[PDB]
Each structure stands twice: as C-alpha cells, then as structure tokens.
C-alpha cells in the first residue's frame, strides 16, 4: 500500500474541507473535528499573543538531530512541572510545531516524524490521564473553541 493520489480518501478530503467551512461560522463537523480546529486556532492565538517572544524563545533552542530529544524533554517536563492546564497543553502543541518547521528549515526533516512521535508518547503517557479525568477534549472545545479570550 504505497501512499499516493489514488489511495487518497475522498471522504477524508470532504470531511476536512467541511470541518473548516463549518468552523469559520462558529460551527463544527464533529467533536474530533472541533478539537482539531480549536487546537489550530488556540495555537495561532498563542503564537500571535507573544508573536516575537515565542519566536525568539524557540529560536534560542539550537536543535540538531543529536540534541533534539534532550531539549524537547527538558522543555516539556518543565512546562508541566507543577501540573497541567489547557493553556500549557496548547503551548505544548505550539512548541512541537515550532520545532518541526525549524527542523525542515535546517534540512533536518528526519526530525519531523520523531518529534510527532515524542509528542504522541508524551500525550498518551503523561497527559491523557489528566485530560480524561478533566472531562476529555470536550472540555477544551467548550473552553477554548466556543469562547473568545477575555481580552
């Protein structure tokens, strides 16, 4: 099953386009789609809230394939040092995203799937119990996806 244009699910394409259009009007295709979209938005919001500072911070990390995991691990353990909230979770996502773009920028593309895998492991191992206890991703949707920032 080599991936390509002819293995590409038409359903998946449609669902993804419709989720987008629905969300632009404050609607959603499904809870999964609403979680994804609220995450994208929260991410943008987080990155734009300290546009320069967030960028200047991530830029301070000088990633190479040989140092990437140890830097990832220190930042994330510290980020959740004294607990979890949805804000930190958004920051966790945005940080991983920044790391991926920088990896590609420096021709370190191999790091993209490793980062994604380190993120998934951290989520499923560390974060999932907290998320589940706190009423699931449905709580994030309600809090962030269905509310605007106080200001």
């Amino acid at each position: 099953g080599p991936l390509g244009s002819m293995s590409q699910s038409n359903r998946e394409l449609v669902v993804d386009f419709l989720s987008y259009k629905l969300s632009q009007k404050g609607y959603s295709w499904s809870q999964m789609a609403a979680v994804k979209q609220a995450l994208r938005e929260a991410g943008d919001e987080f990155e734009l809230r300290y546009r320069r500072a967030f960028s200047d911070l991530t830029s301070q990390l000088h990633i190479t394939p040989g140092t990437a995991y140890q830097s990832f691990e220190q930042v994330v353990n510290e980020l959740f040092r004294d607990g979890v909230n949805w804000g930190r979770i958004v920051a966790f996502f945005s940080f991983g995203g920044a790391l991926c773009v920088e990896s590609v920028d420096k021709e370190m593309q191999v790091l993209v799937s490793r980062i994604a895998a380190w993120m998934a492991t951290y989520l499923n191992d560390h974060l999932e119990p907290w998320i589940q206890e706190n009423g699931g991703w449905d709580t994030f949707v309600e809090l962030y996806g269905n509310n605007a920032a106080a200001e």
Binding site: A42, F46, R49, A53, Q74, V75, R88, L143, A149
Partner: peptide, 21 residues
Amino acid sequence: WAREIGAXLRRMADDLNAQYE
C-alpha cells in the same frame, strides 16, 4: 537553558490560560 525556555512557555501558557479558564 531548556528548562528556564520551558519555564518562561509556562509565563505565556498560564497568563493564555488565565484569558480562558
């Protein structure tokens, strides 16, 4: 270091979270 960038993400995250929660 990576811990004191981690602690000043956690600045940004809590002062986003204190917008929402």
